[PDB]
From Swiss-Prot:
One of its GO terms (biological process) is response to antibiotic. Inhibits by captopril, thiorphan, dimercaprol and tiopronin. This enzyme is not susceptible to inactivation by the beta-lactamase-blocking agents clavulanic acid. One of its GO terms (molecular function) is beta-lactamase activity. CDD domains: NDM_FIM-like_MBL-B1. This is Metallo-beta-lactamase type 2. Its cofactor is Zn(2+). The keyword Hydrolase applies. It comes from Klebsiella pneumoniae.
């Protein structure tokens, strides 16, 4: 078993594949987990999603590294055996965009918030090949998200970072909050170094309101949780103002 310093531990049902862990969340949704070994600190787990949409697969977030991301693609090849149509990455930090090069090498179309793409070079990341833009209420402009199938992308406002986006999985009760949302028992909001402390609470609540019927909330650094992850995150964020 992989036993990270930060992130959910392994439980029955989890599948180890190389350096990664996969968990099935729904008949057509899996969580991918990759681990950054921080020298002297141990492993930091990061989670994304894999969604089957008929004869194709859609990915949310890379792994920390290109090699780990290539392993995700290998797992998809083995277990699903369908092509990856596109990937969405949820902001311009290593845990979410560290593996862009592996996606590009594989010929997978990549999408991110326009702002994430603009920040990427300043964060030592490679930009996605396509930019998503958003309405004044946070919903993605549909023309910028062509053929996204069940992925419903929502920009909740600045929180964990100014560019953080979130993704609901239509046809399921799952929504993905990325690094914006922390678990219902969290002691902290993680790294606030790039955070908007004024708007964080409202942004967390906006995510909840965008996907009001989602009962399983997936996030970057803990196991899937209830909507209490959203409300607890917002309550922690209320204290920052
Ligand atoms: C897990 C984190 C505390 S670190 C990660 C991210 N940081 C990185 O991706 C850095 N490249 C990094 C540097 C040293 C050790 C780990 C990550 C961030 O600052 O939001 N996301 C944070 C978070 O989601 O709260
Ligand atoms: Mn981050
Ligand atoms: Mn993170
Ligand atoms: Mn402001």
């Amino acid at each position: 078993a992989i036993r990270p310093t930060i992130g959910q531990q392994m439980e029955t049902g989890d599948q180890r594949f190389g350096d990664l862990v996969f968990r099935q969340l729904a008949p057509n949704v899996w969580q991918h987990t990759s681990y950054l070994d921080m020298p002297g600190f141990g492993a930091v787990a990061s989670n994304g999603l894999i969604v089957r949409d008929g004869g194709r697969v859609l990915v949310v977030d890379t792994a920390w590294t290109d090699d780990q991301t290539a392993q995700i693609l290998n797992w998809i090849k083995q277990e699903i055996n369908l092509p990856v149509a596109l990937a969405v990455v949820t902001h311009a930090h290593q845990d979410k965009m560290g593996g862009m090069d592996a996606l590009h090498a594989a010929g997978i179309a990549t999408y991110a918030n326009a702002l994430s793409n603009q920040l990427a070079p300043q964060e030592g990341m490679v930009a996605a090949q396509h930019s998503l833009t958003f309405a004044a209420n946070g919903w993605v402009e549909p023309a910028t998200a062509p053929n996204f199938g069940p992925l419903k992308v929502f920009y909740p406002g600045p929180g964990h970072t100014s560019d953080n986006i979130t993704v609901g999985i239509d046809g399921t009760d799952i929504a993905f909050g990325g690094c914006l949302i922390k678990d219902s028992k969290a002691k902290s909001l993680g790294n606030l170094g790039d955070a908007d402390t004024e708007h964080y609470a409202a942004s967390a609540r906006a995510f909840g309101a965008a996907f009001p019927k989602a009962s399983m909330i997936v996030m970057s650094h803990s196991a899937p949780d209830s909507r209490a992850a959203i409300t607890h995150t917002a309550r922690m964020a209320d204290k920052l103002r």
